[PDB]
Structure 1
């Protein structure tokens, strides 16, 4: 399906300790044309890393939805002793970067369109019995101004910490579930309505609440205590009360009282209609 001979480098994208992503062109006709694809390869093919990568490939093979990253195939390099994953290329990259770079193209109607699409992708993942764990705007990708897709870059395996998206029972008991994905979705909705403004990100806000001085595990201890006793990210400037209410309801310490993704999609779509 994808012969290393015809996979031509175009551009270096992300890199981390676990994997790296490149833009490539697949040119089987050798005519300097072909489809542009995004290619992931492993930095170090240990037994565990290759097992993880193979599981990533099997997960992606099973997922087909308009708001989930689109799998294309695999390609073997180094005389078939290395493995690379081929995906559909999305020009605008992460939603976190798109929001910072293209504020001129974004208003509240647009934010709610993206919110709806994220909810629908999460509904789909639940039907596959898949728990995402890593929902955050850094892991949502932008195809164009009208279409976002959930992914999970996973190139590395306080400002950089994923803990600021995690539900309290994930922090205290390592319990990840659909309901903790709903908690993290609430943080995504917060991120959207901050426009990724500097100083207002979840890590920056939580660190201001706990004390910017704190380091190491002390951050975790204070974050758990804060969340367990109703400490929450504040309402973003300009964000409607009804949208903050959705965030608040996702951030319920009572796991079973969080809304479902089907509930959230219906609510967001009904609101979107009314502002449109």
Structure 2
């Protein structure tokens, strides 16, 4: 099933949860899913260890319990795999398969000097992520935080959708709004919970893959990649003026095919957006 770790094991294998970034000599890889993520090395295997931090306690155990329940049921090549967990004490940890190529956001940004992703590889990554989302939707889960920074990349650059648990079952309303603003559908930003909002957010990821630009850049005009989309519709701009210049293999025809899928995903009216299945068909027809 899952591996039951005890906290002392995870502490030993993460340099006692060394919170400096890995660049600096520590074990921290990021923060999210209600915790800090650290690199560990256990039994000849590199792992990612998420140590949950307290919203409040008591609801934390419920969320940890729920994330495990979701992962037990959600096994797929385009989803991050949970390996085990630690629950002894006031301390809660989740242990995942390690993804050596980091996030799609970081690779689109060539963080740390990694080479630019080719157009052909971007197309594969887009299809992989759509496959992961389709598995989630088929199994009545809503991700709620679809973004490039949550699409991880293994040894082969296979797309791995991460950070659910918070993955609700499947129009509900909520007082505690979650997600990442620059990626959120307008109805999600008002608190409607629906798988159609994951589609919208996936439209945004597609624009990041096309253009190489982050969804938000506060030193850019416009700060929001979403707006750049309205420029193309309303302002004599073309997607071609926006194609990532860090590629040498992006043909006009498939670029436009992906942009058209992005544009369908991005309808403001949730009911006009394609479903994940259609998005897969489209992304497949694209290659």
Normalised by the size of structure 2, how large is the TM-score?
0.72
- Per-residue CA distance 1:71-92 (angstroms, 9 max, x = gap): 1111245xx4422111111112
Distance 1:121 1:85, change over 3 A: same
1:21 is aligned to 2:26: no
Aligned partner of 2:21 in structure 1 is none
Aligned partner of 1:89 in structure 2 is 98
- Choose the corresponding residue for 1:189, options 191, 198, 206: 206
Conserved in 2, the CA contact under 8 Å of 1:139 and 1:153? no
Conserved in 2, the CA contact under 8 Å of 1:179 and 1:260? yes
Secondary structure in 2 matching 1:204? coil
Superposed CA RMSD in Å reads 3.3
Q: Equivalents in 2 of 1:17, 1:260: separation in Å?
A: 26
Q: Equivalents in 2 of 1:15, 1:116: separation in Å?
A: 26
* 1:234 shift after superposition: 7.2
Q: Equivalents in 2 of 1:249, 1:231: separation in Å?
A: 16
* 1:165 shift after superposition: 1.1
- Per-residue CA distance 1:133-155 (angstroms, 9 max, x = gap): 1100011101024311001289x
Structure 1's unaligned 5+ residue stretches are 28-33, 213-218
Conserved in 2, the CA contact under 8 Å of 1:103 and 1:195? no
* 1:15 shift after superposition: 3.7
1:237 is aligned to 2:248: no
Distance 1:202 1:105, change over 3 A: closer
**Quick check: 112-121 or 175-184, which moved more?**
175-184
**Quick check: 174-183 or 131-140, which moved more?**
174-183
Conserved in 2, the CA contact under 8 Å of 1:164 and 1:206? no
- Per-residue CA distance 1:115-147 (angstroms, 9 max, x = gap): 100111111001221111110001110102431
1:73 is aligned to 2:87: no
Aligned residues: 240
Aligned partner of 2:51 in structure 1 is 41
Aligned partner of 2:173 in structure 1 is none
Aligned partner of 1:170 in structure 2 is 188
Q: Equivalents in 2 of 1:59, 1:17: separation in Å?
A: 13
Structure 2's unaligned 5+ residue stretches are 16-26, 166-175, 244-251
Conserved in 2, the CA contact under 8 Å of 1:2 and 1:26? no
Conserved in 1, the CA contact under 8 Å of 2:127 and 2:283? yes
Q: Equivalents in 2 of 1:163, 1:58: separation in Å?
A: 27
Distance 1:245 1:206, change over 3 A: farther
Aligned partner of 1:55 in structure 2 is 66
